[PDB]
C-alpha cells in the first residue's frame, strides 16, 4: 500500500495565522500581483480529501472525486476525516479574504480534491493510479483543467501503471510534485517527479533525490472543523512548491509569450531558488525563493 | 526540404586562437577541472559532416553515419565538403593540444558525426529523422552513448515523425539543441522539447528562445585542416551543446544521480545572466557557466 509521509500535529487553533510564515519565507506575496495570485490554475491534491466548506477553501474548490471506500464509495463525497488533505489544500491556495483566516501560496488558484487515502492516511496502488488518471483527465465547466499535481505520500515498490500515469501527466505538461520520505520511495523516485525536501524557518535541513527544499516545520494552514493547525514534517514543504508553480506558470507563460512545457516549468522553479550552503544531495537546487530574479 | 540556418564566413586562417573568446566568455575553462573537460560525453552533431582527420578533431571522433547523397550516399562516408559541420564540431570539442589549434567547450567529449546535410547545406526530413534515431540508438565500444544532440537547421513543415524523433531523444535523457532562425526554418526548433539558442556578440548585445550564447566572429576548425571565423545563431548553438557535457558531469556528481533531460535543461538555464532584453528576445539570458560563484 501507499501512505502519507509521517508528520506531527503541533497545535490546533481558531486563531487566524493571517499570512503564514512559510508563504512569506518563499516570497509568494512578492509575486501575487504579477501572477494574478495564481488565477487560471487547478492544483490536484491527491490526499485524504478536503473540508470543502471550510471558509478559507470553499471558493477554491473546483471539483473532486472520492476513490476510497469512505461514504459508501460514493465518488461525489470527498470530505476530509483525517485533516492532512485540508491542511495541504490551505497551503496551496487558501483564499485571500477580508475576514481573518489564512492565505495560501496561490490564493486565486483552484483545487481539485482527489481523495485517494483513508482516515489513517493509507491507500492502494490502484487508488493512487486512479487519482492520477482523474487528475489528468478531469475537465471543469469553463475550460478548467489540472495544471499541477501534488502528493505527500509514497509506497515502497514500483508499479508499471503508477509510472505510466506519472509519465502521462508530465507529457501533458503537468508537473507532478511529491514529498521526500525506503517505505515511501514511489512515486517520488521517478525521474519525472519533482521531489521536495524541507527546512525549518532557520533554513536548517530538517534514499532521497531532492530537487529543492521549502519550509516544513511549524506550518500553519487550514484544518478540520473550520479550524487551523500547525503541522511539521518533510511533506509540509510540498504544497508550498505546488502552489508556487501556479504563480510561476502564470508569470512565465506571459513573459515568454508561449505555453511552457513541463521541463520549462521545472526550470523556472529551480531558477527561483537560492543555495543554502549544503550539498546538493541534501538541498537539491536550494530553497524556494520566488522573488530572486528581481 | 531542410537547410542550414544562414550564417556568414568571415575569415579562413591557419593561425587561430588557442582559446576562442566564446569558449572563455561562457566560462567553460572555469568548469574544466571539475567536469574533467567533458569526458564521458558524446555530442551528436547533425550537420554537413566533419573533417574527421582534422588535427583538432581526429582524436574526438566516436563514429558517424551519412544520410545524404554526398559520396553517392555511402553511409560510411561522412566527411565535410561544406565546412559548417567541421566548425560546429570544433566549438563543441576541439582537443586541447600543446601544439597550436583551437580548443572547444568540452575538449574531452567525443563527437558523433551525423551527416544529415549535403555539401550545399540541404537535407530531407527523412534524413534528419533517421539521423536523430541513429544518434539515440548509437552505442560505443565500452557503452558510450549520445548525451547531447546538436542541430543548426530548419524547414517549414511539421512532420509528426520528426516531432516523435525529438520526443524520443528527450525521453531517452538527451537534450536536443537547435539554433534559432517567414517560417522557412521553423522546425524542429519550434517543438517545445527542443532547446532553441540565440546569439550575442562579445559586448553582450543581441522564435521561441531558451537562452543565448556567443555567435559573432566565432573561430573554430574548418576544412583542409584550417580554421575559420563564422557568425550566426548556429555558432551560438555548439557553445550550449558543449556546455551541456560539462554541466552533465558536474551535476550528476553533485546531485549523486543520473539527471533527466529536464534537469539538464534546468541546470543550463540556471547558469545564465540577464542582458536587459525581454525574455521573448534573450530567453533566460546569456550562458555564464560559473555565475553561481
Ligand atoms: Na482565507
Ligand atoms: Na586543438
Residue numbers in the entry:
A (entry chain B): 3 to 183, 193 to 217, 223 to 310
B (entry chain A): 3 to 183, 192 to 216, 224 to 310
In the authors' words:
ISPs have key roles in cell cycle regulation, specifically in protein recycling by processing proteins during transition to the stationary phase. In the precursor protein, an N‐terminal pro‐peptide of typically 16‐20 residues binds across the active site and inhibits activity. ISPs are homodimeric, which contributes to making ISPs a structurally distinct family of subtilases.
ISPs are distinct from ESPs with regards to the N‐terminal pro‐peptide, their dimeric structure, and the sodium binding in the high affinity metal binding site, but details regarding their maturation are still unclear. To shed light on the latter, the crystal structure of the Asn3‐ISP was determined by X‐ray crystallography to a resolution of 1.3 Å. In addition to being the second unique structure of an ISP, it is the first structure of an ISP with a native catalytic triad, and it represents the highest resolution structure of this enzyme family to date. The structure of the ISP (residue 3‐310) is dimeric, with each monomer including an almost intact pro‐peptide bound across the active site. In the structure, there are 2 molecules of triethylene glycol (Peg3) symmetrically bound at the dimer interface distant from the active site, which may be adducts of Peg 1500 during crystallization or introduced during recombinant expression. The first 2 residues, 2 loop regions (residues 184‐191 and 217‐223), and the C‐terminal 20 residues are not defined in the electron density. Two distinct conformations were modelled in each monomer due to poor electron density: Monomer A, residues 248‐252 (including the catalytic triad residue Ser251) and Monomer B, residues 16‐20 (including parts of the pro‐peptide). In the crystals of Planococcus sp. AW02J18 ISP, calcium was not identified at any of the metal binding site. The 2 loop regions that are disordered (residues 184‐191 and 217‐223) in Planococcus sp. AW02J18 ISP are ordered in the structure that simulates the active state of the B. clausii ISP. The 2 residues form hydrophobic interactions to the side‐chain of Phe195 in our inactive structure and probably hinder this reorienting into the active conformation (this side‐chain appears to be shifted almost 15 Å in the active state). We thus conclude that the pro‐peptide, with the LIPY/F motif in a central position, is involved in inhibition.
